[PDB]
Amino acid sequence: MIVSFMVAMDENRVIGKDNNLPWRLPSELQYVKKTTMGHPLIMGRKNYEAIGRPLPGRRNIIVTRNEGYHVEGCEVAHSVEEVFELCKNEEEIFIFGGAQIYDLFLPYVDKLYITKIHHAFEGDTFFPEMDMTNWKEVFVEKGLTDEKNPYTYYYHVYEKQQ
Ligand SMILES: NC(=O)c1ccc[n+]([C@@H]2O[C@H](COP(=O)([O-])OP(=O)(O)OC[C@H]3O[C@@H](n4cnc5c(N)ncnc54)[C@H](OP(=O)(O)O)[C@@H]3O)[C@@H](O)[C@H]2O)c1
Numbered sequence: 001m002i003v004s005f006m007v008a009m010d011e012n013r014v015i016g017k018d019n020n021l022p023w024r025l026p027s028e029l030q031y032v033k034k035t036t037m038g039h040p041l042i043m044g045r046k047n048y049e050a051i052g053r054p055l056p057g058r059r060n061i062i063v064t065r066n067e068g069y070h071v072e073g074c075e076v077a078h079s080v081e082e083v084f085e086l087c088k089n090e091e092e093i094f095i096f097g098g099a100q101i102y103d104l105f106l107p108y109v110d111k112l113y114i115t116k117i118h119h120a121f122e123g124d125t126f127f128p129e130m131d132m133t134n135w136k137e138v139f140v141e142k143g144l145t146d147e148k149n150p151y152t153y154y155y156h157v158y159e160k161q162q
């Protein structure tokens with residue numbers, strides 16, 4: 001049906017600014033999570049491991065390959081092979097995976113979002129604007145600084161054909 005993917009974009013990195021990804025409008029995260037609470041969320045064990053997170057969306061699913069392994073506090077998922085079909089399991093599904101994951105999830109994603117932040121230093125995953133022609137933007141929204149977020153950022157809407 002509809003596959004949504006959420007990914008950030010560090011001005012000096014790409015996603016891993018410092019073992020984890022930045023954050024903005026901590027309030028919006030609650031409103032959306034409360035209204036979406038129940039939607040499937042796919043994330044990488046590496047990112048979920050460093051960050052941890054309790055149970056945002058009451059459906060935190062981490063993709064990891066290791067038979068006989070189980071992570072308490074989160075659901076275990078298989079490679080994109082499983083997620084591929086799991087998609088048809090729910091109308092609108094959210095995917096996060098990570099850097100490498102997003103790459104292979106390119107043909108599996110229908111609509112993607114990118115958030116460019118003007119703040120990043122020494123991280124784990126760096127990848128500046130090298131090639132994004134594969135995608136086609138349709139809308140772009142700007143953000144604004146704040147007390148909890150003294151950093152300026154911008155929201156972008158990426159859409160695919162398939
Ligand atoms: N900007 C953002 O909003 C955002 C989003 C996500 C992550 N991040 C950050 O990205 C940092 C590192 O990300 P990363 O890209 O290096 O790793 P990652 O995307 O977070 O996760 C790597 C996963 O890819 C899986 N994988 C790779 N090749 C595979 C294959 N052929 N078959 C099955 N599974 C495969 C591995 O599974 P196994 O190792 O279990 O076999 C591994 O768990 C994290 O610290 C996280 O904080 C940021």
Ligand SMILES: CCc1nc(N)nc(N)c1C#CCc1cc(OC)ccc1OC
Nearest residue numbers: 020021022023024025029032051053056
């Ligand atoms: C703004 C944070 C956010 N908003 C929405 N709508 N969806 C998300 N998946 C996220 C996120 C994130 C990463 C993250 C989560 C976390 O527990 C909720 C703690 C730290 C995090 O890294 C900043």
